[PDB]
Design a protein around this ligand. Structure first.
Ligand code: MG
Ligand code: MG
Ligand code: MG
Ligand code: MG
Lengths: 364, 377
């Protein structure tokens, strides 16, 4: 039986302040994670929690844990967003198993997602390249080998042609810092159209472009055309899409071969959702790369999830430090994240700090 | 609607389905995102029989098996406690049913839901110039197309732009967009409201470039510059304000953002363009009232379905901030729309029963029996 439910926001910081992206402004350095602490049968479990009010909590207390689940042992829709993470943790805690085992040493590819438009104050290309190269080198030093570069400078934040030229310079530049083995992804946050996309792609013929992410809002006809154009020129770049307010027909479009990599968020729709979705995508030969940005907890959940998903691509990694949330069990090495074999999600929350924050700025 | 006159005795006796075919006056070319649209048109139509009387209208998402389950239900059963057509029946039967009510009461639909004269615009200016290498030849052709509309009474024009997104190189395509828009503006004169529709082929900066290049022109609205985004539209609106450039932002056709109306109430989007067939007429009656309550404008999308033009006309009586009927000149066999006429940029809607469209009973019977289907007796 669910006995108690506690809630708290935890705070910390990104290792380096994130600049603008193709569509909006500076993302900054401050980070937060909403967490719930559940208690079932005397033992506590921790995890990401969203869409949960004290009123909502009131109406769950006393419900049999068994009642939270589906026939197929799949946490029920109504509970996922608010409790799927604390529950999974609590399960792992009780059975002393890591969630990836509950859902099956674990080693997962990851990439550095922290390369935003950090060069907008610079008139000189070389200064801008050196700056972005240096940011990439910073990730390399921490064990990153793969890099997702924000592009679309010309969409909103710089003049069109100038920003596009700058996009192409930064990506090449970073291509050189990374090495031949380094996978480069580019993410335009919808700031291109099809012909801009082709211009940028053609200019990057020599670069180890692994995938193109959100070039423009997903469109079956445009992506069909783009895949053909790419095929005709022998340029091997995957089409990635799916974060945010996605087209309701996106999965369908992927099954027809217009999109290769699906990027639904690791918190919304979340973990339980991704497990079922992951199965569907494997069956179609489609790839899974759960989006994660703005929530540090998501990085580590994505890690565990790869166990449940054959065609899992990468963990999306942003170097973040949240007070009270010990993630030292995880290590970055050679373009991969090593998930600890410890109980639950392998994350060690400081019970005292959380208890304080629960009283001060949360509820129970 | 006033449903007090409906007798409990009145039942759905028969539902029949046919596809009507026809042609637009001029073949439509590509738009910013896809290829040639062509000249061929169709309209899926149902004929419903209730209490021995028939009504006709657009019908989608209806199978024989669906209709089989409606036969024998009372007309009253199709309505809410609020006198609203139930959601489950709207796409399949709202048009046949509204037409029927009009036939029974001897009233046009606009009277049921309230000489009706509604602004319209000519939507037929597609990328018809893509075979012309020369910009001057392209401008001349597009002007010619606008004047064909003008000769038939159109005064306001919606111009497809976004040539550089896919079909032409980016820079050349955008130069061409601008020249085309100026050219048509010239032809339409000061009274002409000019609309531009990018079909999502621009980004924010391309949009700004085009708008600045067209500061001169009488631009009434900018439609689907890029896929709706609150942040980008907030920026665009503020940018237009500083320039004193009075152009409305229009969006909402196709698979729209679920938050679009929310963004509109916060002032990022001015004109809402949900389609006249899906989500449909009943939906629009309720939505229009909501948009009016927020001081927002309604311009139901209609393209690919001629029937929707006439529906849009009658809907206008139910919506205070109704902008325009989106007009495409189409002839559908067996669908007599001669009660309607275009004069001085307005569509005149007939005061005749139902939607005022006279279907060829015999032709429709033939199509129903040859290629369509029938349920009931
Ligand atoms: Mg992205
Ligand atoms: Mg997308
Ligand atoms: Mg449109
Ligand atoms: Mg739109």
């Amino acid at each position: 039986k669910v006995e108690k439910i506690e809630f708290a926001k935890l705070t910390g910081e990104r290792a380096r302040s994130a600049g603008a992206n193709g569509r909006i402004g500076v993302h900054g350095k401050s980070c937060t994670v909403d967490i719930a602490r559940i208690t079932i049968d005397g033992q506590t479990g921790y995890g990401s929690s969203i869409h949960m009010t004290p009123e909502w909590a009131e109406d769950v207390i006393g419900r049999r844990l068994l009642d939270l689940f589906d026939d197929r042992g799949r946490l029920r829709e109504a509970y996922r967003l608010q409790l799927e993470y604390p529950v999974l943790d609590w399960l792992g805690q009780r059975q002393g198993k890591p969630v990836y085992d509950l859902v099956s040493s674990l080693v997962v590819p990851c990439y550095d997602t922290s390369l935003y438009f950090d060069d907008l104050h610079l008139a000189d290309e070389r200064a801008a390249v050196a700056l972005m190269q240096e940011e990439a080198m910073q990730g390399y030093a921490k064990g990153q080998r793969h890099f997702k570069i924000k592009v679309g400078r010309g969409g909103r934040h710089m003049p069109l042609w100038e920003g596009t030229k700058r996009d192409i310079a930064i990506v090449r530049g970073i291509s050189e810092v990374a090495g031949p083995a380094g996978k480069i992804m580019i993410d335009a946050n919808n700031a291109y159209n099809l012909n801009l996309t082709k211009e940028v792609l053609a200019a990057l013929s020599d670069v180890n472009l692994y995938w193109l992410e959100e070039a423009f809002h997903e469109d079956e006809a445009l992506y069909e055309d783009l895949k053909e154009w790419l095929g005709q020129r022998g340029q091997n770049v995957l089409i990635a899409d799916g974060e945010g307010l996605a087209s309701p027909h996106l999965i369908e479009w992927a099954t027809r071969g217009r999109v290769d990599v699906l990027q639904y968020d690791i918190i919304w729709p979340g973990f339980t959702h991704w497990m079922e979705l992951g199965e569907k995508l494997d069956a179609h030969g489609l790839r899974s790369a759960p989006h994660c940005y703005g929530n540090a907890y998501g990085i580590y959940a994505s890690g565990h999830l790869s166990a449940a998903v054959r065609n899992f691509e990468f963990v999306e990694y942003d170097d973040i430090t949240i007070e009270g949330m010990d993630v030292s069990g995880y290590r970055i090495e050679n373009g991969e994240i090593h998930v600890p074999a410890t109980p639950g999600f392998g994350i060690v929350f400081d019970d005292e700090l959380v208890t304080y924050l629960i009283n001060r700025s949360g509820w129970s």
